[PDB]
Amino acid sequence: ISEV
Amino acid sequence: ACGYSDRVLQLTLGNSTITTQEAANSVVAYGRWPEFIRDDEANPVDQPTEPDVATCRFYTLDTVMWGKESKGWWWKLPDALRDMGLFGQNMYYHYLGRSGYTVHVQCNASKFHQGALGVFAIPEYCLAGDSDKQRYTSYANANPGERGGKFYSQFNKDNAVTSPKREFCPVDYLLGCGVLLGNAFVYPHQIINLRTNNSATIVLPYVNALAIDSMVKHNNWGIAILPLSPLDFAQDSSVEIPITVTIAPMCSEFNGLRNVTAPKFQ
């Protein structure tokens, strides 16, 4: 995933 | 210790002091004491005016007489105070103004008199009108100032289409607004039961959907005083006692100064  | 009581109060604001030897504690409307607009809730950017002791003091309105036929009385705030010394001036010289209040209602009698006054503080007190016409009550008739208004026992419709009175028709058991009086107790209130107390003291915060608004275009609080139980004395059928309303502005602040507003109350 990629959490900002 | 010493001998203090729930029934003996002193209210001191500015150069004014009230003493009561027979009160029924005091209500702080919705649990909130009056306060100033915080920087993180602020909206007009201009530096406000805060007149403190010159506007936040006890103004006593003209006395009304309670008698056996009395149906009820009502005032709007700030309207009731529009002509009260430096408060009224600050109110009309600025576009924006907020205020909290201490309402102190006065009614004394004797151990042999009888009756119960319902003192009600209502947020956004919208009243019903005259006519077939909806939302037709005029600014001049909506705002009686110090004089206040009265309730009626039934709906007598303003019949003359040609030259309409454009007034309110506040029916007592409908709280003048389409709901039942017995439920008005969900609103901030006290009862002046003549065997118990001479008075009622309700402290009011500024309540509104905005931090500040036009005091000249809009009333925030309404004061409704309806006799829950009628005035009675000995056997004298035309008994009559005075009810005196004393109000003080609290944490008053003003924004948007310019020339004075002169409304037409004619």
Partner: protein
Amino acid sequence: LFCGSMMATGKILVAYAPPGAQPPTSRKEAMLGTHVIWDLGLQSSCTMVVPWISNVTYR
């Protein structure tokens, strides 16, 4: 912006009155509200800021 000749002088009052009262018909009434007194000179132009003073959060 004053676009007059350099030899022309003058002082002007420019104002903003927040709503609710009579719209100003006289300098005397305009004086009372937010205002700038512009003096004409080498700095050709004058800025008046109309400050956000309002009841609602958005107009």
